[PDB]
């Protein structure tokens, strides 16, 4: 592989569900590349079974010189219109950071995400409680990444 | 919605599991757009599977005329290596044909797909003997509001 990730740091973790994801990625490039890299962030739900995955954002990174390179990929939060059952945001979900070169994926970094709603505030401590997405919090387990590598051509 | 789908015709149906998907798509664009459309096709397994969706292919379409447009989206087949429980390519899966403008998905066309196969040693599912059939007359459409320009 001509590109190798050296570090991925999630700048804003924990965070509110609706906050953008900010990943600070450092990589090395060992040979000349004619094109930009294409990074992607995909939101993946629970074994919930009635959820389709959702591309949050893609980012073209370049030009890319040989050396150690760095950038921040700020991705949109999940679109809840794509999440019919609102209650499926809760519990453990997955987040996939991948990169492609000329439409061919070569790397994929998967993380587990913990999701949880605030309990009642003191004033509130009757009505059934909605899942208020503005009161849901994520925490990505940025120290336990699952990495998968794909052979592509780099010519 | 500034873009609307008029027809989706599956060109090579039924077909072998490992044959490319070919969708002839006709859509109407009503206003000028600054950017391309971004099509994707997404393999979706069973409820019983723990595998997240598999993006099979994507394609920029553009620039977009005001009017009625047609193109063909030819998408690579599923990668067998990302299906660790190979048996769940069998029976009824899903394909989602979707389109995004500026990284926002505005339309999703969902299909059911039927899949069937043509001392003793355990056998593995032979993929070259699996046929798919997309149920192309019964698409489930979903529009989402996006910002466009």
């Amino acid at each position: 592989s001509i590109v190798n990730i050296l570090s991925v740091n999630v700048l804003n973790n924990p965070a509110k569900f609706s906050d953008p994801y900010k990943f600070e990625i450092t990589f090395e490039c060992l040979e000349p590349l004619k094109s930009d890299l294409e990074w992607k962030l995909t939101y993946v739900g629970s074994a919930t079974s009635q959820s389709y995955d959702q591309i949050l954002d893609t980012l073209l990174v370049g030009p890319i010189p040989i050396g150690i390179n760095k950038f921040v990929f700020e991705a949109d939060p999940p679109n809840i219109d794509l999440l019919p059952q609102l209650s499926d945001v809760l519990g453990v979900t997955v987040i996939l950071l991948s990169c492609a070169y000329e439409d061919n994926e070569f790397v994929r970094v998967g993380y587990y995400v913990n999701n949880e709603m605030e309990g009642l505030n003191l004033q509130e401590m009757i009505k059934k409680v909605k899942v208020d997405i503005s009161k849901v919090w994520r925490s990505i387990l940025a120290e336990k990444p699952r990495v998968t590598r794909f052979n592509i051509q780099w010519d | 919605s500034i873009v609307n789908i008029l027809s989706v015709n599956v060109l090579n149906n039924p077909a072998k599991f490992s044959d490319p998907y070919k969708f002839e798509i006709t859509f109407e664009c009503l206003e000028p757009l600054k950017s391309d459309l971004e099509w994707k096709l997404t393999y979706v397994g069973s409820a019983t599977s723990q595998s997240y969706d598999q993006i099979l292919d994507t394609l920029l379409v553009g620039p977009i005329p005001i009017g009625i447009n047609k193109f063909v989206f030819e998408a690579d087949p599923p990668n067998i290596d990302l299906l660790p429980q190979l048996s769940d390519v069998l029976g009824v899966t899903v394909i989602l044909l979707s389109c995004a403008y500026e990284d926002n998905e505005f339309v999703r066309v969902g299909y059911y797909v039927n899949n069937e196969m043509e001392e003793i040693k355990k056998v593995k599912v032979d993929i070259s003997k699996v046929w798919r059939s997309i149920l192309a007359e019964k698409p489930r459409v979903t529009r989402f509001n996006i910002q466009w320009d």
Partner: peptide, 21 residues
């Protein structure tokens, strides 16, 4: 602080900081 731009096709694009070569 990053130079962000947008291709004709509508893709956002950033220029990465070359740290060292």
């Amino acid at each position: 602080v990053q130079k962000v731009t947008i291709t004709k096709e509508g893709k956002k694009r950033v220029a990465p900081q070359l740290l060292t070569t």
